Symmetry: D2
Subunit: 396 residues, 4 copies
């Protein structure tokens, strides 16, 4: 039939893919090639014109990567997809395609660190100015908009405390003032949140996280209107960032996304159990998780997200020293800075990634001395809880 007609799990498995036309091979072939050959001068001209369709050169497009792009377009309910070398490249290819010197961007403050660095330091050096606001307060977004504003940029949920942003409301504000809304949907995946359905114009992911899910691919994806995606591909990627995805990486991501539905269900089932355990623990001062009713934006979360996610942050009694002791005491959770893998990952920003940052400047960023971030994996939740309880008990 048409792949956009089936159920979401069916789409996860089938969308964008079909048996190879030449051989019937079920798995999408890995077209690990740079070069494509033309049958005639005319065929080469047709493709190039670009009157006609077909492949030319992997930087421009590739059959393996095309399958991934089409699948994610289907999953996000967008027109077209564009794969990239990294989540960062997805974000910068998008914004550098849309903006030029003199343009303006309104961005959430609570965003991925490397994204913040790009917006804070790199963009202004190209004459593109950025205003940072608390996107949990839609009025601050409105107030920051200028005649030059081309884009409003948000993440939800957001690090490090998993605060939310009302996508539908922000979309309405952005659009009334003539701007596009770009949403980083990395944390949720299309299985749990669909920003385009809520009015966003463009969605970006680091597929490095849940979409691939297996901790072995760095990559990104952009989904949006065909007209925009074509510009992101034939100008942004081709000319500006050069951030194309390797066919092998696309193939692995296609392979990983096959289990997206069942992975997200288990990630979130596990996370809710662990979140409730942490909330009941007298040594834990705070637990940040959209699935707990005490979450400041709980009802918004229930309307906007189909599941509360696989990520939890929490504060351990005793601040920095307690946090360091705790992470040094886990036996199962692994100390690392990524998320959305099949293994449970844990990190303590104050002692690990922000040790040199001013204590008072971290607090401003929302990073307290006792804040721990946990990416819940596919292990038995009882084992993860036991490991956490063991480490917490020791640390406090």
């Amino acid at each position: 039939s048409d792949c956009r007609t089936y159920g979401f799990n069916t789409q996860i498995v089938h969308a964008g893919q079909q048996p190879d036309p030449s051989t019937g091979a079920l798995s999408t072939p890995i077209f690990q090639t740079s070069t494509f050959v033309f049958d005639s001068a005319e065929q080469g001209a047709a493709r190039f014109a670009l009157e006609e369709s077909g492949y030319i050169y992997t930087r421009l497009g590739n059959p393996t990567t095309d399958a991934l792009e089409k699948k994610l377009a289907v999953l996000e309910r967008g027109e077209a997809g564009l794969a990239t070398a990294s989540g960062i490249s997805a974000i910068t290819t998008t914004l550098l395609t849309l903006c030029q010197q003199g343009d303006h961007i309104v961005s959430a403050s609570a965003i991925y660190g490397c994204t913040h660095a790009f917006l804070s330091h790199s963009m202004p050096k190209f004459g593109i100015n950025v205003s940072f606001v608390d996107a949990a307060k839609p009025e601050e977004i409105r107030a920051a908009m200028r005649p030059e504003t081309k884009v409003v940029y948000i993440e939800t949920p957001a690090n490090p405390t998993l605060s939310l942003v009302d996508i539908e409301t922000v979309a309405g504000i952005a659009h009334q003032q003539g701007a596009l809304l770009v949403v980083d949907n990395t944390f949720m995946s299309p299985y749990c949140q669909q920003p385009l359905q809520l009015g966003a114009d463009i969605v970006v992911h680091s597929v490095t996280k849940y979409i691939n899910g297996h901790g072995d691919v760095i990559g990104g994806i952009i989904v949006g209107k065909q007209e925009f995606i074509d510009q992101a591909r034939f100008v942004g990627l081709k000319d500006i960032t050069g951030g194309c995805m390797s066919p092998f990486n696309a193939w692995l991501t296609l392979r990983g996304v096959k289990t997206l539905g069942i992975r997200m269900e288990r990630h979130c089932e596990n996370a809710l159990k662990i979140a409730r355990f942490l909330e009941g623990h007298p040594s834990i001062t705070r637990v940040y998780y959209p699935g707990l009713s005490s979450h400041p934006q709980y009802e918004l979360g229930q309307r906007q997200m189909s599941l509360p996610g696989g990520i939890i942050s929490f504060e351990i009694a005793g601040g920095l020293e307690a946090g360091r002791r705790m992470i040094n005491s886990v036996e199962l959770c692994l100390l690392a800075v990524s998320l959305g893998d099949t293994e449970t990952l844990i990190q303590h920003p104050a002692s690990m990634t922000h040790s040199p940052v001013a204590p008072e400047e971290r607090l401003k960023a929302g990073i307290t001395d006792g804040l721990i971030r946990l990416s819940v994996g596919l292990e038995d939740p009882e084992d993860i809880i036991n490991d956490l309880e063991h480490a917490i008990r020791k640390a406090t």
Copy 2:
């Protein structure tokens, strides 16, 4: 010993690589991972500081890709290397790292098309201005320099007629006026030309071509001073382009470069034979090849290049129609737009990639109606010559 002490062929094989420390595995392991795990909070902090060394996350660095970066640094006689998602990303990561709004670039006109598009249309939109000149005339480079000039950018040999640029002379000019010299060394590879040895500051490659050599990887590399490379990595790649190379791609490129020396010898031995055949053919009006004495900059070529290269361009009698007939008549050479593969590739820009471009505007670009570009592969030269003679005879 120290890898920088051995002969060039030995370096090609060994530099940057050694048996795996844990297992003794001879082949560089494919570290196809996103995540790296820390032993303690302290270890994570050390690496991040960045007081100490080790890995963190593949976008930042990876053991497989590091081996490739170190090898190419050795081969180009530079301090450090940085691998990228594509040749384009190597160029743009470099220039976007070096330049900001208000800055200026002097560039050769005879450059790779996509590079031209970036410099012509994208750079100016970021407030970075570019002046194009004929780099075969070093005085035009000097005359175009401004107080704001940060970079002089050149390719040699250059498309489509394989004209040359005097690297040593241009380096001297750039440096006297306080600018850096960036050279795209894709066409030659470090086996045939070493721009850093001639005064260039930074070298970029599309490894998609000869360095990989097997037509199955899109990738780039940047080589230069440690101080610059660190900025290209921790700002340019990390924040701006996001154009990181997949570990699998790095592994394939490491594998391909093992045979770089013997491949270049055969490519060039074959090309010289074919070039001489073409020069003797009464149906061929011109042959462009650095190995022919009639080449305008022949002596410069002999001083600057150890071999004349594997690329040949030539003009067939009868212009566009003849060129189209010829390429449609080959049986062995493959119609495609890449180069530096093991297979012989052929293309006729006027009928294939520039069919819609104004005939008189192509002529300005140096693209005549009868111009054919040939990437000579590893086949028996007698077979390639027979195929060419067959197609030429038919076309004329």
Copy 3:
């Protein structure tokens, strides 16, 4: 801790694996090497002796493949594992290691076809005789045993009607008569059935099916006592079959098995729903599925298997023509002969794989003209049911 102490899901994720010791890489590196290097003559001698441990050559052993072997040993509760080029190679490496001319094997008749071919035609040509019996009747196993019997071989569930074999009972019989019990556990995976826990001596899998689960690897595994596995490795694999697994294949299988638990849960949840639909359909004469109470060995299934599996066979009204029409009428299920993939696969042996086999000889094999075999995938069960209902309605 010790990996054998955690919950089964935790083991699925972690067992046999750990971060790379040299770099901390979380993903098991792909040690795609043939050669391993020694530090000294002495080190080479030690490993070879084989006094000491370490690697030598990938045919003998490899770090990537070792991780897989250790994981599956843990999952099956066996001492050691040995990976192979295919499921067939797992079976033949095992049996050719155990048996020699003059030896005897008692085997189930209801086994994988290619296994049957090996036992029926190849074994006897090496002087190794085989008696086939109905293994659903343990007394037939006993009656067929001879002084020369070395091995009893069974599959459960078995094609094509998913009949069962009482592993514990057969193990007792085999052992009393001094024979080993070998069980092919491919259909269930260690998540659903553990033959070693029930008395079997050796377990074999085609990992091509559920263990890999992604339809992109041909491979096998053998699990058993260390003493046996060492012989299977250093004689059976090394000298006889040469059926070693590629490190890349082992890496993919490690990647696939990460989701084994959640995949099996969904496969079986989906299959039960589809099985019940089929049982309610007036156009379907029979449905063969361990999860239906009408199954001849239902109670045995409940004791021996934790889930009823993802495979269903059924007979459609109207025999051969109806079966052909049905499979030619599906739009979602894919016509193919493998199983345990994420996509739903369907096949009709009478018109597809046994068309030339004598109708009356197929009936003997249990293959009726209307028999359809279905491998239930991860799609929405409602979509699969709709596709089946559509095709059945058309066919009848």
Copy 4:
């Protein structure tokens, strides 16, 4: 045209390969699949019949592996090829296909060790008897032939002293007595020796060595008549050994073989230089290399081999202790037991792989205490010579 008409280098590059029919992808796609899908019941039946052609399941055949099989068939001037999991599997799949209990094999004594183990211990246990002879003496082959002899098996050149076997002469003897001649051509590759052209019936390789050439693939290949290969595939591989090659491994081998011609030229050019150096060294008692005129079968070598090969063995003054000191003193050559890689590999069997073997029993095998085996790589020969001279000087 027809690939069998071009020059050998052209064949190396092109034979068995063409651009992908669906997309034009130049690189052979990696068809990393287990499953193949049929368009209809009829199509599945046709393929299975096996009336018609196409793919079914990777163990039986695969598009990537087919390309490799066709290429090597062309290079060896044989009808058909069959890829395998290892060199060992190529040999055993062949012999177990041809022989059954009561059959007999005449084999050279000077053969690969693991092959010897199979023939010495495993074959007889299947009722297949083997007589070992000195194949450098064709009369011993004749004298050992029995009415039951099905196969004569030889390697040339042979370990450890690189003695030769007269293929044409042995072929004539085998054929007159009604037997097949099987030749292991691993050491030479089709670029240097073509046993089928000299009368052999079947050729086997470990592609692990020169054919792949990059030290990252374990694999084998069999080349011979279509009638035989079909049996090796549909019985030997399918039923007996299960030793199929992974599509990824086939793709890597296809990639490696692209440079076979230029690699062999350099390997042999380097080896001849090193062999002459060793022959001139007063600390070296003997040098075994087909390229030295002092070689016992020099003239036979010149007729049978196009190049003398990349392998050298030699004896160092001072026996075992000297040999151990020497290999422990090299800085560039790597201590390892494989050959045909791009890196120079060295080994000293008496102290490394045969330390526990009886000194007098090694001598019988032709392994003297001072015997060193060297696999010459692609490094600068001057660097290898300097490393050897350094280590030899120290050791003596």
